Amino acid sequence: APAEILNGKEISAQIRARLKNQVTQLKEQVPGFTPRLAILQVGNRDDSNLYINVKLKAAEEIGIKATHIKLPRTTTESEVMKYITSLNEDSTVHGFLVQLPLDSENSINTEEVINAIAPEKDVDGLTSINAGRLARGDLNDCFIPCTPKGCLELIKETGVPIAGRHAVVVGRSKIVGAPMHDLLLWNNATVTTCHSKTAHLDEEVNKGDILVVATGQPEMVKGEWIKPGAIVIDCGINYVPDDKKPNGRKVVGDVAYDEAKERASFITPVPGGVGPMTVAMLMQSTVESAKRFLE
Template sequence: MAKRLLSVTSRCIALLRQRQRPFSDSRGQILDGKAIASSIRKNLKKEISDLKSKTDSKFGPCLAVIQVGHREDSNVYVRNKLKAAAEIGMETRSIKLPNAVGEAEVVDAIDELNRRNDVNGILLQLPLDVLQSVDTDYCINRIHPQKDVDGLTAVNSGRLARGEMGGTVIPCTPRGCLELIERTGTDIAGSNAVVIGRSKIVGSPMRDLLQNRNATVTVCHSKTKDMQDMVRRADIIVVAARQPQMVKGDWLKPGAIVIDCGINDIKDATKSKGYRLVGDVDYESCKPVASWITPVPKGVGPMTIAMLLQNTLECAKRQLAD
């Protein structure tokens, strides 16, 4: 009887350990950001439609984007954001300022949108393409925190760093990365996570989000020593280093989740444009080692736009409640 009890107990403990194992033994599963983002946008479209019907069509979440200058990459990003917003029934406003403007003109445009009740979210497209000196941080912090859909004001970033999540707007790319990690079914709590890069837009808020989920987080950057050894101990790796194909497969712990925020173009004579897009992760060498990995493109990029729309809707709902 005692032996049978011991055997049953041993099997129960083994089963419990198996269920608690947070990381998959499978390899090379692709986190399709494009498909996941499409699903999120579909849900947002339905939610906006339902809210409009309940408020006699008076509720129309509105995203305003301010673009300074004429950078071609910014033109593409703004166009994609406004198109995605319109496709889910969100109102949009596009404010384009010439690159000759000064800080006062940028602030005036922000203040005007802050005052408008029919604008729920304000995004200042970065980087600013200006001919004279403009304090980007000052301009960002002129955006009302409740309309800061990029989550970059000192108020929102400070609340996130303190773990005060209620009503805090989370930066779009880190929020998209977290959504992708959660889609794997991984138990983030107790995991070892490495974030490569410490920018205000991706690295630092990503650290805060993972810590808020009870991961143990290490932030690596250009001055980090023995970065490869740190990465090899990580269950979750988020890379935003702006270094093409920097992270190699032999850096990884087998079964790690790899989220690649980078997008870089490298020369490729086989392509009609003479280049191809790659991330900060060497996809081909990392894919066989990782349990889950994001491709570039169609990984983090589409999730960033989906989270921008999610943030705008949430800001609009909070303003409607007020």
């Protein structure tokens, strides 16, 4: 019998509707309080413009005030640092992020920039201090990066308790795999982390009651590798030409969906699974930052 499909587009829409109501209610409980997000951009990349306007739009629908600071390509590292410092010190701003990658004519140390973000405002969760808190089990008040956050939410939507399950994470990146490990461990799964040097990957994958794949290797995890009854979470966004589609390209996951859907009990499709969760998760983190500041 085939896997239930976790519909990230519907679940994300429910999350954004709930956050809207919560934000409406925070303002009525505490009049004048305005949850506030800022996004700092360097340069003028087309892709970043599109992603930023999606974030700003979601924030405005929820009643979060969203500020976009767009610095020119001529900007220096020292000017970027000054803006980060000013955002840290601005008590009207509850959360902010720096859109990546930076687009400057000058050399800018990306890591130093990110690590100047005050940890209590780090809504993308990529500062070293936040990673360190997450990695050592302080989940009550650290920020969680948006993709693994959405993965955890998808897993919880199944209603299957995580504790005691053997979870497998394929990938160990800063943005996905590593924080995904941390969330699974502090929800009491027994966790195996695999990567490009893992031997007999198929046999490792086949031990996962919960499987999260974040490799960027299109459809590499085959249906045969999936443990029967597993929860399969697929972070992959891989482009493949396909003239039968409206824009001449299909999106496929890091998992071979058509065979994995016959083995799993719950599976995320691609497109429509993990991807649409991500902006909702940023908004949820923004709302958490605003609630903490309200104490």
